[PDB]
Amino acid sequence: TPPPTQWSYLCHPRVKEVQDEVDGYFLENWKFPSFKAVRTFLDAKFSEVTCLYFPLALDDRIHFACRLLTVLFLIDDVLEHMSFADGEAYNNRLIPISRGDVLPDRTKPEEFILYDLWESMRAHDAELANEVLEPTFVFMRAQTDRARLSIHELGHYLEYREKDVGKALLSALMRFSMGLRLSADELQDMKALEANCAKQLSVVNDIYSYDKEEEALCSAVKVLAEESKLGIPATKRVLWSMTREWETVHDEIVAEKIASPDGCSEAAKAYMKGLEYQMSGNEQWSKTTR
């Protein structure tokens, strides 16, 4: 029931091969705790998600993104079940290894998978590989801290999502996967568009995750439904409405930077189009998942 969108999602052409390859890799190395754990793992189709997010990734780089997002999802799950303290230590052990400053204990998959991944990434393109490092660490460190006083206004909720460390990681990983080389100025002048993108991705995620998220929460669906005193079906229709307006905001900012006097590099252009795909791909995926 979502209103019409001007964008068309796209899935990476090599999704089939890459998914078998990467899922395969983890089935060979990750210490799943049970066969049911494995069913759960395969049902997630992390490589398909990655391929819907970065349909323009270079053919020889898309597997890197799948491997990185997969291991990070696995890790995120591990951290969710351990105390704040043990989680702190988990990351502290892994980050140095990810930097390649510490050799991995060959009997600990969480150690050697990350080590081999990052090494192979730098080996492919060290300059961009390193552009993804920090965002990754900021992200895994943010998976330990709990609390988070549930927000209740629409503005503050969106402002909060704009700064989502995960969405920031996606954009960096995307530049690497597409081989995009942007200047510091270009990236800085990109913040607005990025904020809008992060915001759009969230609301769409929320719209589709509200139902299942019912048991006993940070959701634009909950936040707006209360502020406006509308029912869930209605609230959702309104969020869909806004979502389409933010897609239009994206188009205006893009056209504005392209028709700009100072010009717009091919890398910048490719980057903006990449964000478009993140949003359209995210929807296509949320629209057909779990």
Curated annotation (Swiss-Prot):
Site positions for Important for catalytic activity: Y53, F73, F139, W285
EC number of the protein: 4.2.3.9
Cofactor(s) the protein requires to work: Mg(2+)
The keyword Ribonucleoprotein appears for this protein: no
Residue positions binding Mg(2+) 3: N205, S209, E213
Cofactor-binding details, from the entry: Binds 3 Mg(2+) ions per subunit.
InterPro entries the UniProt entry points to: Isoprenoid_synthase_dom_sf, Terpene_cyclase-like_2
Annotated phenotype, changing Y53F: Causes 100-fold reduction in kcat but a 50-fold decrease in KM, resulting in a 2-fold decrease in catalytic efficiency
GO annotation (BP), single: isoprenoid biosynthetic process
Keyword Lyase attributed: yes
Knockout consequences: Reduces the production of PR-toxin and leads to a large increase in mycophenolic acid production.
Pathway, per record: Sesquiterpene biosynthesis; aristolochene biosynthesis; aristolochene from farnesyl diphosphate: step 1/1
Catalysis: reaction(s): (2E,6E)-farnesyl diphosphate = (+)-aristolochene + diphosphate
Keywords recorded for this protein, A-Z: Lyase, Magnesium, Metal-binding
Residues that, per the record, bind Mg(2+) 1: D76
Its biological purpose: Aristolochene synthase; part of the gene cluster that mediates the biosynthesis of PR-toxin, a bicyclic sesquiterpene belonging to the eremophilane class and acting as a mycotoxin. The first step of the pathway is catalyzed by the aristolochene synthase which performs the cyclization of trans,trans-farnesyl diphosphate (FPP) to the bicyclic sesquiterpene aristolochene. Following the formation of aristolochene, the non-oxygenated aristolochene is converted to the trioxygenated intermediate eremofortin B, via 7-epi-neopetasone.
Protein name (Swiss-Prot/TrEMBL): Aristolochene synthase
Source organism of this protein record: Penicillium roqueforti
